[PDB]
Design an enzyme around this catalytic site. Sequence first.
Site, short mmCIF file in Angstrom:
data_model
loop_
_atom_site.label_atom_id
_atom_site.label_comp_id
_atom_site.label_asym_id
_atom_site.label_seq_id
_atom_site.Cartn_x
_atom_site.Cartn_y
_atom_site.Cartn_z
N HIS A 173 0.65 5.60 1.40
CA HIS A 173 0.03 6.61 2.26
C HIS A 173 0.27 7.88 1.48
O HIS A 173 1.42 8.19 1.18
CB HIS A 173 0.74 6.75 3.60
CG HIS A 173 0.73 5.50 4.42
ND1 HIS A 173 -0.44 4.86 4.75
CD2 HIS A 173 1.73 4.74 4.89
CE1 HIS A 173 -0.15 3.74 5.39
NE2 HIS A 173 1.16 3.64 5.49
N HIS A 228 0.81 -1.21 0.00
CA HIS A 228 0.00 0.00 0.00
C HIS A 228 0.84 1.26 0.00
O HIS A 228 2.06 1.23 0.13
CB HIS A 228 -0.90 0.02 1.25
CG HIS A 228 -0.13 0.08 2.54
ND1 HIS A 228 0.41 -1.04 3.13
CD2 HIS A 228 0.23 1.13 3.31
CE1 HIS A 228 1.08 -0.68 4.22
NE2 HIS A 228 0.99 0.63 4.35
N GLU A 287 6.03 7.23 6.68
CA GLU A 287 6.23 6.09 7.57
C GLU A 287 7.71 5.82 7.77
O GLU A 287 8.53 6.00 6.86
CB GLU A 287 5.57 4.86 6.94
CG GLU A 287 4.36 4.34 7.69
CD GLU A 287 4.75 3.50 8.89
OE1 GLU A 287 5.69 3.88 9.61
OE2 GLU A 287 4.10 2.46 9.12
CU LIG Z 1 2.30 1.87 5.53
#
Ligand SMILES: [Cu+2]
Lengths: 334, 334
Positions: free
Chosen positions: A64, A62, A69
């Site tokens: 963001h 995925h 992160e």
């Molecule tokens: Cu993540």
Amino acid sequence: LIVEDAPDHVRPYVIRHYSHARAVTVDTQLYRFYVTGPSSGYAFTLMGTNAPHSDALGVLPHIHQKHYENFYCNKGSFQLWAQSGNETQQTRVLSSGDYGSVPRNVTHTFQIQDPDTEMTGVIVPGGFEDLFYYLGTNATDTTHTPYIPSSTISTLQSFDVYAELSFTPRTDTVNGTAPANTVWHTGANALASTAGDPYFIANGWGPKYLNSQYGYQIVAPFVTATQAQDTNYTLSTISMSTTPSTVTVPTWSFPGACAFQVQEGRVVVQIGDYAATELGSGDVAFIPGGVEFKYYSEAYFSKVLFVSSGSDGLDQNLVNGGEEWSSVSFPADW
Amino acid sequence: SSLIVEDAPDHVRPYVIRHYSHARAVTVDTQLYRFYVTGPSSGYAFTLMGTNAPHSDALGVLPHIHQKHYENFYCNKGSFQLWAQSGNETQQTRVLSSGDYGSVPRNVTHTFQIQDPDTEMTGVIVPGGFEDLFYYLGTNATDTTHTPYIPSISTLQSFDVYAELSFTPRTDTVNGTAPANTVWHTGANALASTAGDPYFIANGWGPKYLNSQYGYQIVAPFVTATQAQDTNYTLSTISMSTTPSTVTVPTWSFPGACAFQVQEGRVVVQIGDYAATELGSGDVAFIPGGVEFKYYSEAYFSKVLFVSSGSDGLDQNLVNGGEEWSSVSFPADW
Ligand SMILES: [Cu+2]
Ligand SMILES: *[C@@H]1O[C@H](CO)[C@@H](O[C@@H]2O[C@H](CO)[C@@H](O[C@@H]3O[C@H](CO[C@H]4O[C@H](CO)[C@@H](O)[C@H](O[C@H]5O[C@H](CO)[C@@H](O)[C@H](O)[C@@H]5O)[C@@H]4O)[C@@H](O)[C@H](O[C@H]4O[C@H](CO)[C@@H](O)[C@H](O)[C@@H]4O[C@H]4O[C@H](CO)[C@@H](O)[C@H](O)[C@@H]4O)[C@@H]3O)[C@H](O)[C@H]2NC(C)=O)[C@H](O)[C@H]1NC(C)=O
Ligand SMILES: *[C@@H]1O[C@H](CO)[C@@H](O[C@@H]2O[C@H](CO)[C@@H](O[C@@H]3O[C@H](CO[C@H]4O[C@H](CO)[C@@H](O)[C@H](O)[C@@H]4O)[C@@H](O)[C@H](O)[C@@H]3O)[C@H](O)[C@H]2NC(C)=O)[C@H](O)[C@H]1NC(C)=O
Ligand SMILES: *[C@@H]1O[C@H](CO)[C@@H](O)[C@H](O)[C@H]1NC(C)=O
Ligand SMILES: *[C@@H]1O[C@H](CO)[C@@H](O)[C@H](O)[C@H]1NC(C)=O
Ligand SMILES: *[C@@H]1O[C@H](CO)[C@@H](O)[C@H](O)[C@H]1NC(C)=O
Ligand SMILES: *[C@@H]1O[C@H](CO)[C@@H](O)[C@H](O)[C@H]1NC(C)=O
Ligand SMILES: *[C@@H]1O[C@H](CO)[C@@H](O)[C@H](O)[C@H]1NC(C)=O
Ligand SMILES: *[C@@H]1O[C@H](CO)[C@@H](O)[C@H](O)[C@H]1NC(C)=O
Ligand SMILES: *[C@@H]1O[C@H](CO)[C@@H](O)[C@H](O)[C@H]1NC(C)=O
Ligand SMILES: [Cu+2]
């Protein structure tokens, strides 16, 4: 000063390693939220994930779009895969003290390898933990054991989790890294010079700076303004000697909130109008922006993972007031 | 008189020595050695030492054997490669990272090489007193700041070091191990089936036992009577939960000396008539045989490296009273 779950508002606090910290489990993984959106005024989320070996990915690939992160391996080991746009897909197996940076819009996933694995995540901005309250099941974990022994895609988007269903994690890993010709635990690692690109720093192999103003402190930057851009924060480890008798422990105050988790050693922290407290392995100290604080290492050598909201918090301050350094150890003489 | 000492005592007595204390430091090239437990301090039961060193492109020691001493390599942090071979058996090699262990019985040829910048090896040698070799070959180090390391044939038989010039460390390492048909960080590791053979246990992959008598403690044996034989000692890690409020912390008094070095967490030790003292990472506690003591974890989870003279020390006691266990984490409920 010591709390068992991150406060539901901003205030100085210390939360011990493996405290309940609103624990939730997702399958075999146990997540703890040491710093949350409510506890940091939404500056950042600092969480710890403990989990056993898995033959499956720990999360679906995925992106963001609005969160940066950061993966730090406290112990054990896990593999991290990351790719920015059409740049070559990168993957590293992080072991104790290793770091992986995942800027916004970078596809990623990870897989837990060792039995006693702990992954500390630093996500900016804060409030990211809501995602895990949804995916997870509350855990009482009375004994404080590290982990318990044994439309959705649309919904995830509202938590800033965009599934990348066509991403195939590369499977040609050798010696903890892929593709070939990458440097992992065999040479120096540099932070990405271009914003948006993921990068990895093996324990002790990245750039370092020695600050000698208040004893010896070595800052190993992980994220600087170059990489943070508007996410506006810094991240690094700070290694510390004891404070010599000739030095007065300084009092600090910064506009943005900051926090640190002890990785090795014993660090005494004094924040605001609270009694000084000594932190050990995995304990986290949180300092609200604008609150005065002091800290020093009681151990002869301590190392902490440090995060700060803003461009000029403690780590950047020590770097600016210090010099380039090429060792994880400080000088033998004062 | 005080419990905490900066160098191991010259006679048997209870004591605690903090991580990176002077501990009769010596350097051999870039390596800095510390002797937390010595022959004199343990009545020659065993030696517990720490070696800190930076990455090296060369072997850290020439291949050799000890005919009268059992060597044990434990990786506190960083990473180093260890090579070992017994008689006509195949030569084995593993790259040890944090928490990994390598067993080197008497008459086993071995050598090692430091890989990561911030590497620390904890050595347990039985019987005690072998450290004279390091005093002899080393140069005394003052290391005023207590920095981990300083930044930058016939003759040795008397010290029980026998050169093995015919030994050639294998160079077909892949994924941290050689030969290819071995298990390293990919599956369970067993202790050697008999004495005299080297073996390696990756962090969390070896046999474990859960003792539930005084809170939860997980013992991961490294050396048992099977492997020790007449060297007469045990070695393991002991993981610990906090002590339930309804449980009385037990008092122990063993025939032989024992000691432990905290790896993760915060462990309080109360020895004899000395004050309860909390140990953090790398700190070492030494307890003479015949001296009463209590210990408990203040952290929610702590892990220590433990050694005992005799066949029935603390770790063996906890194993005998407990049960086989297949996780590095203990139950979530009491
Ligand atoms: Cu993540
Ligand atoms: C040093 O350590 C590293 C680890 O750090 C080792 O690297 C591993 O190496 C192995 C072997 O090369 C890799 O496994 C293989 O991966 C192949 C590719 O997998 C992906 O594509 C396929 C095809 O679309 C998907 O099905 C896969 O999806 C599954 O796995 C992923 C994980 O990546 C999960 O997320 C998914 O949910 C799925 O579970 C991947 O996307 C894969 O094709 C291959 O599978 C064959 O072989 C296995 C046994 O090895 C069989 O069980 C299986 O039936 C397949 O068998 C066919 O193909 C082989 C090969 O052609 C033939 O020989 C057979 O006869 C048969 O036709 C296998 O799974 C692994 O991914 C990789 N790990 C990493 C992290 O890189 C190094 O090997 C090691 N080096 C040394 C020397 O020890
Ligand atoms: C994965 O990581 C491994 C390290 O953990 C890598 O292994 C290294 O691989 C290199 C290249 O193959 C080796 O270096 C070569 O070694 C040979 C042999 O050296 C020995 O023999 C010669 C000649 O008799 C002698 O002079 C030496 O002193 C040695 O006794 C040399 O001939 C080459 O010139 C070259 O130096 C390393 O030795 C090896 N390290 C270890 C610890 O095994 C591996 O290559 C990595 N794999 C991948 C795909 O990246
Ligand atoms: C991330 O990707 C989205 C979608 O293209 C884009 O609108 C946004 O500006 C990107 N953000 C950053 C920081 O690149
Ligand atoms: C689970 O815990 C969260 C706090 O993280 C709380 O908001 C929620 O009410 C709890 N849900 C249940 C079912 O107990
Ligand atoms: C960056 O963060 C600091 C501290 O939180 C804050 O004072 C500053 O206004 C922020 N910068 C921007 C451009 O928002
Ligand atoms: C070690 O080897 C020596 C020399 O061969 C031998 O005399 C001694 O008995 C051996 N010791 C052990 C414990 O195998
Ligand atoms: C090892 O092999 C040699 C022959 O090369 C032999 O003399 C010796 O007895 C063997 N070792 C053992 C324990 O059998
Ligand atoms: C070793 O000890 C001698 C005598 O005390 C001292 O003069 C010398 O400086 C020491 N060497 C080092 C490197 O500390
Ligand atoms: C083994 O060690 C224990 C504890 O020090 C000691 O009491 C015992 O006598 C030793 N056994 C032998 C055979 O020496
Ligand atoms: Cu040796």
